[PDB]
Enzyme design. Structure first.
Site, PDB file in Angstrom:
ATOM      1  N   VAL A 167      20.730   1.674  17.122  1.00 28.66           N
ATOM      2  CA  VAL A 167      21.166   3.071  17.641  1.00 28.66           C
ATOM      3  C   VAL A 167      21.287   3.246  18.904  1.00 28.66           C
ATOM      4  O   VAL A 167      21.405   4.513  19.599  1.00 28.66           O
ATOM      5  CB  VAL A 167      19.971   3.962  17.053  1.00 28.66           C
ATOM      6  CG1 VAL A 167      19.662   3.845  15.542  1.00 28.66           C
ATOM      7  CG2 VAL A 167      18.511   3.680  17.876  1.00 28.66           C
ATOM      8  N   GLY A 168      21.440   2.133  19.837  1.00 22.53           N
ATOM      9  CA  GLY A 168      21.375   2.279  21.305  1.00 22.53           C
ATOM     10  C   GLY A 168      21.786   0.860  21.641  1.00 22.53           C
ATOM     11  O   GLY A 168      20.956  -0.234  21.354  1.00 22.53           O
ATOM     12  N   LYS A 169      22.670   0.729  22.604  1.00 20.41           N
ATOM     13  CA  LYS A 169      23.070  -0.504  23.279  1.00 20.41           C
ATOM     14  C   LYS A 169      23.428  -0.255  24.656  1.00 20.41           C
ATOM     15  O   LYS A 169      24.298   0.402  24.966  1.00 20.41           O
ATOM     16  CB  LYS A 169      23.996  -1.276  22.465  1.00 20.41           C
ATOM     17  CG  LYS A 169      23.879  -2.844  22.862  1.00 20.41           C
ATOM     18  CD  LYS A 169      25.006  -3.798  22.131  1.00 20.41           C
ATOM     19  CE  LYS A 169      24.726  -4.977  22.333  1.00 20.41           C
ATOM     20  NZ  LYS A 169      24.646  -5.427  23.937  1.00 20.41           N
ATOM     21  N   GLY A 170      22.702  -1.084  25.693  1.00 21.07           N
ATOM     22  CA  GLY A 170      23.107  -0.632  27.035  1.00 21.07           C
ATOM     23  C   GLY A 170      22.559  -1.844  27.951  1.00 21.07           C
ATOM     24  O   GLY A 170      22.080  -2.986  27.415  1.00 21.07           O
ATOM     25  N   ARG A 171      22.564  -1.742  29.219  1.00 21.81           N
ATOM     26  CA  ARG A 171      22.237  -2.951  30.366  1.00 21.81           C
ATOM     27  C   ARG A 171      20.909  -3.110  29.880  1.00 21.81           C
ATOM     28  O   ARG A 171      20.207  -4.090  30.321  1.00 21.81           O
ATOM     29  CB  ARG A 171      22.374  -2.075  31.524  1.00 21.81           C
ATOM     30  CG  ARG A 171      21.433  -0.770  32.052  1.00 21.81           C
ATOM     31  CD  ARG A 171      21.443  -0.555  33.370  1.00 21.81           C
ATOM     32  NE  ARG A 171      20.769  -1.658  34.271  1.00 21.81           N
ATOM     33  CZ  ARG A 171      19.182  -1.620  34.101  1.00 21.81           C
ATOM     34  NH1 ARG A 171      18.617  -0.725  33.242  1.00 21.81           N
ATOM     35  NH2 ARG A 171      18.693  -2.232  35.126  1.00 21.81           N
ATOM     36  N   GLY A 173      19.351  -3.331  27.024  1.00 21.75           N
ATOM     37  CA  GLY A 173      19.294  -3.950  25.813  1.00 21.75           C
ATOM     38  C   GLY A 173      19.777  -3.336  24.685  1.00 21.75           C
ATOM     39  O   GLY A 173      20.907  -2.982  24.447  1.00 21.75           O
ATOM     40  N   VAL A 191      18.438  -0.931  21.163  1.00 26.83           N
ATOM     41  CA  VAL A 191      17.315  -0.201  20.430  1.00 26.83           C
ATOM     42  C   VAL A 191      17.744  -0.033  18.987  1.00 26.83           C
ATOM     43  O   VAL A 191      19.213   0.329  18.760  1.00 26.83           O
ATOM     44  CB  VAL A 191      17.045   1.407  21.024  1.00 26.83           C
ATOM     45  CG1 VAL A 191      15.981   1.966  20.041  1.00 26.83           C
ATOM     46  CG2 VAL A 191      16.531   1.262  22.486  1.00 26.83           C
ATOM     47  N   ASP A 221      11.147   7.725  36.031  1.00 22.87           N
ATOM     48  CA  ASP A 221      12.451   7.672  35.542  1.00 22.87           C
ATOM     49  C   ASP A 221      12.847   8.738  34.621  1.00 22.87           C
ATOM     50  O   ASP A 221      13.373   8.671  33.291  1.00 22.87           O
ATOM     51  CB  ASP A 221      12.953   6.401  34.805  1.00 22.87           C
ATOM     52  CG  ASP A 221      14.384   6.115  34.550  1.00 22.87           C
ATOM     53  OD1 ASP A 221      15.035   6.800  35.462  1.00 22.87           O
ATOM     54  OD2 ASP A 221      14.666   5.114  33.910  1.00 22.87           O
TER      55      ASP A 221
HETATM   56  C1  LIG Z   1      19.274   5.867  26.882  1.00 21.38           C
HETATM   57  N1  LIG Z   1      19.307   5.985  25.568  1.00 21.38           N
HETATM   58  C2  LIG Z   1      18.907   5.122  24.554  1.00 21.38           C
HETATM   59  O1  LIG Z   1      18.287   4.084  25.056  1.00 21.38           O
HETATM   60  C3  LIG Z   1      18.927   5.534  23.296  1.00 21.38           C
HETATM   61  C4  LIG Z   1      18.319   4.569  21.994  1.00 21.38           C
HETATM   62  C5  LIG Z   1      16.888   5.356  22.200  1.00 21.38           C
HETATM   63  N2  LIG Z   1      16.252   5.539  20.942  1.00 21.38           N
HETATM   64  C6  LIG Z   1      14.743   5.482  20.919  1.00 21.38           C
HETATM   65  C7  LIG Z   1      14.066   4.651  21.944  1.00 21.38           C
HETATM   66  C8  LIG Z   1      13.142   3.462  21.766  1.00 21.38           C
HETATM   67  C9  LIG Z   1      12.557   3.068  22.704  1.00 21.38           C
HETATM   68  O2  LIG Z   1      11.708   1.889  22.515  1.00 21.38           O
HETATM   69  C10 LIG Z   1      11.519   1.627  21.128  1.00 21.38           C
HETATM   70  C11 LIG Z   1      12.499   3.264  24.159  1.00 21.38           C
HETATM   71  O3  LIG Z   1      11.739   2.796  25.194  1.00 21.38           O
HETATM   72  C12 LIG Z   1      10.338   3.033  25.293  1.00 21.38           C
HETATM   73  C13 LIG Z   1      13.218   4.621  24.420  1.00 21.38           C
HETATM   74  O4  LIG Z   1      13.416   4.861  25.804  1.00 21.38           O
HETATM   75  C14 LIG Z   1      14.092   6.277  26.100  1.00 21.38           C
HETATM   76  C15 LIG Z   1      14.194   5.051  23.457  1.00 21.38           C
HETATM   77  N3  LIG Z   1      14.416   5.588  19.797  1.00 21.38           N
HETATM   78  C16 LIG Z   1      15.287   6.341  18.995  1.00 21.38           C
HETATM   79  C17 LIG Z   1      15.680   6.899  17.560  1.00 21.38           C
HETATM   80  C18 LIG Z   1      16.681   7.160  17.310  1.00 21.38           C
HETATM   81  C19 LIG Z   1      17.965   7.093  17.948  1.00 21.38           C
HETATM   82  C20 LIG Z   1      19.324   7.372  17.573  1.00 21.38           C
HETATM   83  O5  LIG Z   1      20.220   7.964  18.406  1.00 21.38           O
HETATM   84  N4  LIG Z   1      19.692   7.353  16.007  1.00 21.38           N
HETATM   85  C21 LIG Z   1      20.979   7.845  15.531  1.00 21.38           C
HETATM   86  C22 LIG Z   1      21.065   9.198  14.847  1.00 21.38           C
HETATM   87  C23 LIG Z   1      20.782  10.206  16.010  1.00 21.38           C
HETATM   88  C24 LIG Z   1      21.034  11.696  15.364  1.00 21.38           C
HETATM   89  N5  LIG Z   1      22.534  11.938  14.848  1.00 21.38           N
HETATM   90  C25 LIG Z   1      23.110  12.858  15.467  1.00 21.38           C
HETATM   91  C26 LIG Z   1      23.423  10.695  14.958  1.00 21.38           C
HETATM   92  C27 LIG Z   1      22.688   9.272  14.120  1.00 21.38           C
HETATM   93  C28 LIG Z   1      17.706   6.780  19.306  1.00 21.38           C
HETATM   94  C29 LIG Z   1      16.667   6.054  19.618  1.00 21.38           C
HETATM   95  C30 LIG Z   1      17.966   6.369  22.866  1.00 21.38           C
END
Ligand SMILES: CNC(=O)[C@H]1C[C@H](n2c(-c3cc(OC)c(OC)c(OC)c3)nc3ccc(C(=O)NCC4CCN(C)CC4)cc32)C1
Length: 297
Positions: free
Chosen positions: A12-16, A18, A20, A134
């Site tokens: 659900v996420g990919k960047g510098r 790493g 997620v 941050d």
């Molecule tokens: C800089 N952006 C990012 O990194 C991205 C990936 C981060 N993400 C974290 C998370 C986890 C961490 O550790 C485990 C972190 O570090 C402690 C963390 O730090 C910010 C974030 N949980 C998440 C849970 C779900 C989603 C997500 O989008 N699902 C897809 C659906 C979304 C809604 N419909 C409209 C589309 C499909 C994304 C998540 C956000």
């Protein structure tokens, strides 16, 4: 442990930073962050903070486990947390607008989480003060109940009466440049002073407030999503771009005229400006912001 029990289902996420992933642990969704080598020390700092500090709060991302696991002929650094299917505040705000209650619930829950981070509670059952360093919309996750939780503690700094020295590098410009407070950009911040790091969080909170308020509908009117300073800096702004705008020109995000037709957005506009003072010591505390938002309801 846990890393074995976890299946990765979708990235659900990919960047510098790493990647997620949404993973499954005993059939339950978890969020798994696999750190880039670049950010390996953030993994350690975040892991150690969560493992040593009772940091259970509804408005802070819930930690589950951390692990070191060699997979692709290389060691992987995993951080496993609760999975918030709605994703980041940044992405949510681009999909929908807010009514008055949904807007307040978002901003108050962020204030609550940040106040809890900031507060030092003495003793066992307590916690050191923590400054995030941050804070931004991409580091905030939205919950189905409409509250948010603050995420990503890899740059956080802790303070208690146990020591005067802080686990901070010599470079103060660690965060996201667009959200960097003026005293960080011009590097006049007192690196020795823990309270200075709290005030840098408050500046960033003000910017997040502005981002959220833009999406609250009032009288059929609403702004499109924009990051702070979209109108005056390019994407991936440089330190110098940011410093000229924020330190030399001392500009701030503009308040849409339509906000003053609504008492909530009027109150929030007042609040974010009290987060944006050039002088760090004039900025409201996190607890003051929370108390104020508790009353604007
Ligand atoms: C800089 N952006 C990012 O990194 C991205 C990936 C981060 N993400 C974290 C998370 C986890 C961490 O550790 C485990 C972190 O570090 C402690 C963390 O730090 C910010 C974030 N949980 C998440 C849970 C779900 C989603 C997500 O989008 N699902 C897809 C659906 C979304 C809604 N419909 C409209 C589309 C499909 C994304 C998540 C956000």
């Amino acid at each position: 442990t846990v890393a074995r029990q976890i299946t990765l289902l979708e990235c659900v996420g990919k960047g510098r930073y790493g990647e997620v992933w949404r993973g499954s642990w005993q059939g339950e969704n978890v969020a798994v962050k696999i750190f880039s080598s670049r950010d390996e020390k953030s993994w350690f700092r975040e892991t150690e903070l969560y493992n040593t500090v009772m940091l259970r709060h509804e408005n802070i991302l819930g930690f589950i486990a951390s692990d070191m696991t060699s997979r692709h002929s290389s060691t992987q650094l995993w951080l496993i947390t609760h999975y918030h299917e709605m994703g980041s505040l940044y992405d949510y705000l681009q999909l929908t607008t807010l009514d008055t209650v949904s807007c307040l619930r978002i901003v108050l829950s962020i204030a609550s989480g940040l106040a809890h981070l900031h507060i030092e509670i003495f003793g066992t059952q307590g916690k050191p003060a923590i400054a995030h360093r941050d804070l931004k919309s991409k580091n905030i996750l939205v919950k189905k109940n409409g509250q948010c939780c603050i995420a990503d503690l890899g740059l956080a700094v802790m303070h208690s009466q146990s020591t005067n020295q802080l686990d901070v590098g010599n470079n103060p410009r660690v965060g996201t440049k667009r959200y960097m407070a003026p005293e960080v950009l011009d590097e006049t911040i007192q690196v020795d002073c823990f309270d200075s790091y709290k005030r840098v969080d408050i500046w960033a909170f003000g910017l997040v407030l502005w981002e959220v308020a833009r999406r609250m509908v009032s009288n059929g009117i609403v702004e499109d999503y924009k990051p702070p300073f979209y109108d005056v800096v390019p994407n991936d702004p440089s330190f110098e771009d940011m410093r000229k705008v924020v330190c030399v020109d001392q500009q701030r995000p503009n308040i849409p005229n339509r906000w003053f037709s609504d008492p909530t957005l009027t109150s929030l506009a007042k609040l974010m400006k009290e987060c944006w003072y050039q002088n760090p010591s004039a900025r409201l505390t996190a607890l003051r912001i929370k108390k104020t938002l508790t009353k604007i309801d």
